[PDB]
Amino acid sequence: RFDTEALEAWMRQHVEGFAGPLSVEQFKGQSNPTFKLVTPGQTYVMRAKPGAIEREYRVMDALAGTDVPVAKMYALCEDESVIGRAFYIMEFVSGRVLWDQSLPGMSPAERTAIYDEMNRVIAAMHTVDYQAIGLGDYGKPGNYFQRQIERWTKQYKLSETESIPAMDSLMDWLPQHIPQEDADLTSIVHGDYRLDNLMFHPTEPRVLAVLDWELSTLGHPMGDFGYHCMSWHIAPGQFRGIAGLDHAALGIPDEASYRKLYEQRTGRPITGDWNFYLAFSMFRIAGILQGIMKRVVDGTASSAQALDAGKRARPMAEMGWEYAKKAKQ
Amino acid sequence: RFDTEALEAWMRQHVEGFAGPLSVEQFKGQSNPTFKLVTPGQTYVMRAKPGAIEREYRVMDALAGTDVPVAKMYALCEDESVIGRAFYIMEFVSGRVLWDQSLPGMSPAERTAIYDEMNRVIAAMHTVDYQAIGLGDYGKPGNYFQRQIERWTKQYKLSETESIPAMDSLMDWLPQHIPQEDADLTSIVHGDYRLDNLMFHPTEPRVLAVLDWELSTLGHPMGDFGYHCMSWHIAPGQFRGIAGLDHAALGIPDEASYRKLYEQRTGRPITGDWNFYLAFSMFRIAGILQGIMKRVVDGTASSAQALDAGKRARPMAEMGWEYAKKAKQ
């Protein structure tokens, strides 16, 4: 509920090519409010807040011109005078957000293409020269895994609602097993890279825009790629994984081939125990899910969706520990 | 707490080669009591009851002389006069009961052998001429899946503790999709065929005895083989599955190869939608696990182990529905 004329005035000076009249609509749902700004010349998307939005804008803006396809940025407004809250203006991209990783409704050749493009974008993101595009201080590089292991160890300990031995074993195992090979390697890391955070062209298997960058920073690629590969280790039905489905029939590549393709795109081979990267990723996911459980156990979020995600903490922790034990020691 | 002299008298007349003195010990745990009968000449195992033990004895006895390795039977006692309860006497077999399906501690070649032998025994069981060994009326053959779908549909409806849409979809989907190809095919079905129900030779990869036959009957092989293949579709950590582990590295065969081997041993190819067989198996398992939840929700079994198994009903039901949707319609 704000002054749309004050915005139209601001947009004339700060949004390239802008020309009213302007009509604001809202989207049903996204942490911070999202609106659809409509003008005859074109449509934009405004991301406001009640009253770290600026990092999304920053990373997405810096990536224009790279191979990581992203929505075009128009303007960021930190001056809460104009509308009563901070916001930014983006392009309104139109396309498909696919949810089910098994890609129902497609031919095998199509599934191959969706997966191949999805691969290409992660390789591209991780090969970007983040310093040349001005993101040099976008996050703290080096010492990624020990920083993260410690963070999530402290977080679980704060939210622990029950004794989960596999979690405890993880918290003790991980810190003593951080690969030494490529420990300093850093790149832009999306944070939550997966199929449903991609906007595909309405009919072609090509991503028009990588979405939800609010968790992104500078970090180790395998923290990002490892989380992305979870799909091959989680089974279908709540957490829409693809473990045990007949991938060769469906046209979905095997994880061995997917990693190999990523290695060739990025030019460097994945050194370091793959089971550690997986074990870490499962640990992290367990930590996040325990956060939800702790809030559900003392009623901050009672949602059916919420306690569903909370009950999944233990099995994630348990699965993490199993992969840990398959790793070098 | 019984008369061991009355048993020694009975054993002289009913147990081939018996000769005391006799010393009875008990085993820690097995539904119906189990004892270790010790004599200088040899050791036996006695399976009593408080006060369908006879089917185990019957099937295990009939299988002697076949390729399904089993403990040797000595005598069945239904005359509750002798000891105050019905019982039977078996050979005391000594060997390994392996629990973890990933087979830690082994070389790849060893894992290949454990799996290959495990395959051989199921093929063998399912190729046995049950009528020639006198089990013709051991169960009701034909119409297996519809009989089972109906049984578990009624069972879930009796124990339903919450709304599980994937379960409901299964209960409606399955009955309308029972394969018509090989619908009458029947064989002996173990019921719960898995690694931990096998007693391996202490150092060789060969099964000395298939255990826990209390659920066995006559039925469709894929009800038994499908349950056995669950391992490739369930992930590690609570339900010790092998979904997503690097099978080629570990020396564990891929499910495609495992089924192919079974087909060659049994001489007939698996006709009928594999995803239906899997979907059915997941449905059945969900039903059994909901039984436990219903008892836990109203306190018949409060055990930590019990509510762990009860919480697994939904995900099993949800995973079943996903495989159902990959099947022919």
Ligand SMILES: [Ca+2]
């Ligand atoms: Ca999203």
Ligand SMILES: [Ca+2]
């Ligand atoms: Ca057992």
